[PDB]
């Protein structure tokens, strides 16, 4: 069975009713459509209001249908060339112009506010956030760890960030209840506050595999047989702009390399630090026990001399 | 006595002074009124400023009252047809136009900013968030649990979210002090960070009923006799738009089904995952102890062979 | 010596350099000044640009100084009456109009964005938040507690909120180092998550005075002799508008009543709940030990029969 | 090797692809460039659209190239002087004006929204936040502490804030894996909630050096030999404006003074409190053990009489 979360963050699960937030529907559109909406939205008002001037036919230099348009438009954009102006003969025309120019300001506001979000939406910001292409399991100061690399491709922004991971795996309860996509938080710094990143250079996020880890009894041999997927979420804030952004990826069982290690990316240069973003996804192997974490602990606690 | 929080989130408790944030009063209005405000707001300025042109009567082609309006309007919307223009004979008229066109820009700003929030307000966003219609109590890996289902009806948005629950119940302290609506947080993931949802598909939020649970000594038999209400709060963020949203529901004692279980909603399809949102509210029963959690623990701790 | 934080939230401590955020300086102004800024800001541009038209004197119907203004204004607000229009005789005038109408759009943006925040700033929102006028110390299910009341005067908004309190008191370290306003967090729900309020009706925030409380050894007799001040902070979110708000108050030693209790405010009405906001600040006394919490615990632990 | 984080917050690490968020690229620009962009952006549209009027040559008083501009401009800014107006002879010209005035409103929105953020961006706000120029290590109620001073130079804003610190130091794991910039959170209030500042007056942030501190075995003698750097992050919220801001500094090994103490800044004045911001960075020495924290604890635990 395929994956739940793609490496680019999108899910693989499918769900009229969403008309509750049409605005949200409007921002997620590609520009081509978005403009086309606004093209239409303006015409339909200019059609409607023009057809009320012709119902009112106060008028200067107006003939067939086409003539009322160039006015209704020039009135609403507030152009008013002066070839088509207003008289005071009728009560009706003089008040339409007010409702029109009030309402013309509404449509503009729906548009400006509409545009702001569209340009300001930070999905674009978080596009420079990056997760290592694989995860690794290997030893680190005696303890076996699951590790992935995190980083932002721009220097200038989002240095504050925070990381979290969920393990998605099927489960059957003792009572035989089946949970297809049961999920459990994977400890990556929460209790100590080490999940609050400071993205100077790309970081290796580590999860120490201990008695509480879902990974406690997985050995090297078991891993390939396990059907599990780690979703990895990063939420940070753009320095230049208050707003916050999410970025996610996934690691499926076969993208977890046992007994590897991440290539360093940071190196010294003419008395400076340069991040070699080419070694970003790069790993390498090292002698690493084949045993589960649980069995390592046991072996270790029985060696006390 | 009736409920405190309706299933749609609104409270059932009633509280001039709120004139402190008139802006907030303005957004919570239904459009019909909102536009009517702005209709009025524009007229009253056009009335006031027009009545200052007539006090100043610099003027071109102006007769009775109606004539000053079409100018004051055309000056403030900055139409200026050119049938009614300005001369330099008077000092007063030339400076009014500046205060007017400065002030006309203020009113517009109150309106645009007013509209932005109105369209952007995320009450509409959170309308697709949904809580199961009931809660269930039943066993799960040996431990008795209170469970409700959570989900968002759209795929495209708010996948990050976070859940919390409060129990509302009357209390008398030993000292005899009476607390009508005493509330206590109900553990749904806080300590482990499992209250930070990832809404791929609708989730069963679980509360394990343990020595700290307010539900520790409620048996199946007791439950119906208890007068309690669980308020359930969900706060997440719209992917497409930075802003965050709240959604709430309530479960009153009679909407807690003892010995049931939630129908799975997720199923496989042609090598894919589809959420059958029809089974969303659906539960079913299973053999489940009738005992309180406290008495189960006891019975269990005395069985150690 | 007087208080550090007034009951309305403002501090009593005094601190050119703040020109770093002139925008922030602009919003905190009272409207009278704010408008006066914008009045001036517009004139000074209309003065400058008009004086560049007169340097360029492309022109129609322009005499003395006053004539260039009504154009520069009509060009920048984009009125353009058509009594003063443009010719193509000069290269200079034709390009000024572009820089002008580009720059005129900048000033407007500084103003609209300036206004938005001014109206949207939520200091006004949090004005309906309210703290009890006093705090009380008295017993509650065996444990001695410090309690203050919290609430929002509007029904319609900010039901989610969160509370925190700091105790400000002078300190000398063993090493004799003097800390005038040393502050310590006062536990009001943090560890259990009970500091995450749900403001249905006004709540009694409680702090259980235990071995970790700064209040552990204060008896009834000691209290008046103590020189301490509790600052109380409330941060919630306006339902109708995403943004968050702070509200603070203070309790100084003499506003802590020992052996009292808050009048209930909530009562039943024709099968409903009504909050009697008149009893909001109201307390009353009850028989309450005079002893410190520490000495109560001792007396209690020695009574085990 | 030099420092990772400058005292003003900027990093010393270097990283086309950033075209993903051009908007963010646009705000981080200095005004000179920003305006120049908008100058250009407007001209290029006025060039393009003017060249479509000349392709359409509906026209009044239009000669060479220069004449179409003053129209295309007056149409898009919606000036329309009335010397160059529209006729109904052609179908094409009448519809261009609509696409033009729709599209003219788009460019404006990109600009206004562009300006808002630029003025509202809070990098400017956080410029008044300040960190002591050094850190100190010395004793405090028996426990050895690392201390730095924090404060905001304005009274009127950002009183709520929150502090966090990371220690950056090289590491080699037992397995010989090398971590150049390994970082660990430094405890400054997280567990007790004392990292949630209330910036009445500048505060001394303290980190008690205990068995969990990275500083546990550093003695006075060792310190100078250590190659370590403390990054210090402050995130608070501007009262007058909802938005939040980050401010950072760094302390490198030689800016940690052993056996010093911060000069008090707060003093009493005519029955008031005044902060003498001149003594802000000022420290002074006091008799302080030369031993590491670890060795002090030992010596202390062996003295129990
Ligand atoms: K925690
Ligand atoms: K005109
Ligand atoms: K916690
Ligand atoms: K905590
Ligand atoms: K205009
Ligand atoms: K005009
Ligand atoms: K005009
Ligand atoms: K914690």
Q: Do domains B1-13+122-305 and B14-121 have the same CATH topology?
A: no
Dist. CA A282–CA C285, nearest whole Å: 71
Tokens representing C100 are 């002008």
Residue C221: which residues within 8 A CB-CB, separation 6 or more?
C290
Q: Is B191 on the interface with A (CB under 8 A)?
A: no
Dist. CA D230–CA D137, nearest whole Å: 13
Dist. CA C205–CA C147, nearest whole Å: 6
Tokens representing A183 are 């999920």
Which sign does the torsion angle of CA D86, D91, D96, D102 carry?
positive
Say if residues C21 and D124 touch (Cβ distance below 8 Å): yes
Helix axis angle, B31-53 relative to B65-76, nearest 10°?
Answer: 110
Residue among A241, A219, A292, A252 nearest A119 (CA): A241
Judge: B88–C67 Cβ closer than 8 Å, yes or no. Answer: yes
Residue among A273, A283, A145 nearest D181 (CA): A273
Dist. CA D207–CA D145, nearest whole Å: 5
Q: Is C269 on the interface with D (CB under 8 A)?
A: no
Residue among D161, D132, D116, D162 nearest D279 (CA): D132
Residue B140: which residues within 8 A CB-CB, separation 6 or more?
A173, A175, A177, B147, B206, B208
Dist. CA B85–CA A100, nearest whole Å: 22
Strand partners, C252: C229
Q: What is the least distance, in Å, from the CA of B258 to any CA of chain C?
A: 26
Dist. CA B212–CA B167, nearest whole Å: 13
Neighbours of C211 (CB within 10 A): 9
Residue among B136, B138, B145 nearest B289 (CA): B138
Helix (H, G, I), strand (E, B) or coil at D225: helix
Task: Give, in order, the Cα–Cα distances in Å from C35 to each of B52, B92, B103.
Answer: 20, 20, 8
Judge: D185–A193 Cβ closer than 8 Å, yes or no. Answer: yes
Q: D14-121 adopts what CATH topology?
A: Helix Hairpins (1.10.287)
Q: Is B203 on the interface with C (CB under 8 A)?
A: no
Helix axis angle, A65-76 relative to A91-120, nearest 10°?
Answer: 60
Method of determination used here: X-ray
Tell which A residues from 238 to 257 touch D, by Cβ distance under 8 Å. Answer: 238-242
Resolution of the deposited coordinates, in angstroms?
A: 3.1
Helix (H, G, I), strand (E, B) or coil at C146: strand
Domain ranges of chain A: 1-13+122-305, 14-121
- For residue D155, give the nearest of C14, C86, C109 by CB distance: C14
Residue among B155, B165, B255, B256 nearest B205 (CA): B165
Say if residues B83 and B61 touch (Cβ distance below 8 Å): yes
Ligand 7 ion: nearby residues, β-carbon < 5 Å:
A 80; B 80; C 80; D 80
CATH of D1-13+122-305, one of 3.10.180.10, 3.30.1130.10, 3.40.228.10, 2.60.40.1400: 2.60.40.1400
The 8 Å CB, 24+ separation contacts for C279-285 are C280/C130, C280/C132, C280/C149, C280/C151, C280/C202, C281/C132, C281/C133, C281/C134, C281/C149, C283/C132, C283/C134, C283/C136, C283/C257, C284/C260, C285/C257, C285/C259, C285/C260, C285/C261
Dist. CA A8–CA A252, nearest whole Å: 13
Task: Give, in order, the Cα–Cα distances in Å from A148 to each of A205, A231, B26, D248.
Answer: 5, 11, 49, 26
Which residue in this structure is represented by tokens 């219609």? B133
Q: Which residues of B touch C196 (CB under 8 A)?
A: 164, 185
Which sign does the torsion angle of CA C236, C238, C243, C245 carry?
negative
Dist. CA C272–CA C261, nearest whole Å: 25
Q: Is B4 on the interface with C (CB under 8 A)?
A: yes
Helix (H, G, I), strand (E, B) or coil at C90: coil
Judge: D11–A155 Cβ closer than 8 Å, yes or no. Answer: yes
Dist. CA A143–CA C219, nearest whole Å: 50
Dist. CA C190–CA C196, nearest whole Å: 8
- For residue D112, give the nearest of C88, C109, C164 by CB distance: C109
Say if residues D54 and D69 touch (Cβ distance below 8 Å): no
Helix (H, G, I), strand (E, B) or coil at C69: helix
Q: Is C270 on the interface with B (CB under 8 A)?
A: no
Enter the DSSP assignment of C181: T
Say if residues A178 and A171 touch (Cβ distance below 8 Å): yes
Residue C91: which residues within 8 A CB-CB, separation 6 or more?
none
Say if residues D85 and D93 touch (Cβ distance below 8 Å): no
Per residue, the 3-state secondary structure of chain A, as one string, reads CCCCECCCCCECEECCCHHHHHHHHHHCCCHHHHHHHHHHHHHHHHHHHHHHHCCCCCCCCCCCHHHHHHHHHHHHCCCCCCCCCCCCCCHHHHHHHHHHHHHHHHHHHHHHHHHHHHHHCCCCHHHHEEECCCEEEEEECCEEEEEEEEEECCCCCCCEEEEEEEEEECEECCCCCEECCCEEEECCCCCCCCCEEECCCCEEEEEECCCCCCCCCCCCCCHHHCCEEEEEEEEEECCCCCCEEEEEEEEEHHHEEECEEECCCEEECCCCEEECHHHCCCEEECCCCCCCHHHHHHHHHCCCC
Residue D37: which residues within 8 A CB-CB, separation 6 or more?
D26, D29
């Amino acid at each position: 069975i395929q994956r739940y979360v793609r490496k680019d963050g999108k899910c693989n699960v499918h769900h009229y009713r969403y008309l509750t937030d049409i605005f949200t529907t409007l921002v997620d559109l590609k520009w081509r459509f978005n403009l086309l909406i606004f093209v239409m939205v303006y015409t339909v008002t200019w059609l409607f209001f023009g057809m009320i001037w012709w119902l009112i036919a106060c008028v200067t230099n107006l003939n067939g249908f086409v003539s009322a348009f160039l006015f209704s438009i020039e009135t609403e954009t507030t152009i008013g060339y002066g070839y088509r102006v207003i008289t005071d003969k009728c009560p009706e025309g003089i008040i339409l112009l007010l409702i029109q120019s009030v309402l013309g300001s509404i449509v503009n506001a729906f548009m400006v506010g509409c545009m702001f979000v569209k340009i300001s939406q930070p999905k674009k910001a978080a596009e420079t956030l990056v997760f290592s292409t694989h995860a690794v399991i290997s030893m680190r100061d005696g303890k076996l760890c699951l590790m992935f690399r995190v980083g932002d491709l721009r220097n200038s922004h989002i240095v504050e960030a925070s990381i979290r991971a969920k393990l998605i795996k099927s489960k059957q309860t003792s009572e035989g209840e089946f949970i297809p996509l049961n999920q459990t938080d994977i400890n990556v710094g929460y209790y100590t506050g080490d999940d609050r990143l400071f993205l100077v250079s790309p970081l290796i996020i580590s999860h120490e595999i201990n008695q509480q880890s879902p990974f406690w009894e997985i050995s090297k041999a078991q891993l390939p047989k396990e059907e599990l997927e780690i979703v990895v979420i990063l939420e940070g804030m753009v320095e230049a702009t208050g707003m916050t952004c999410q970025a996610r990826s996934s690691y499926i069982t076969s993208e977890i390399l046992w007994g590897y290690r991440f290539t360093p990316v940071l190196t010294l240069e003419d008395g400076f630090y340069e991040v070699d973003y080419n070694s970003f996804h790069e790993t390498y192997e090292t002698s690493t026990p084949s045993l589960s974490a649980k069995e390592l602990a046991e072996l270790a606690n029985r060696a006390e001399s």
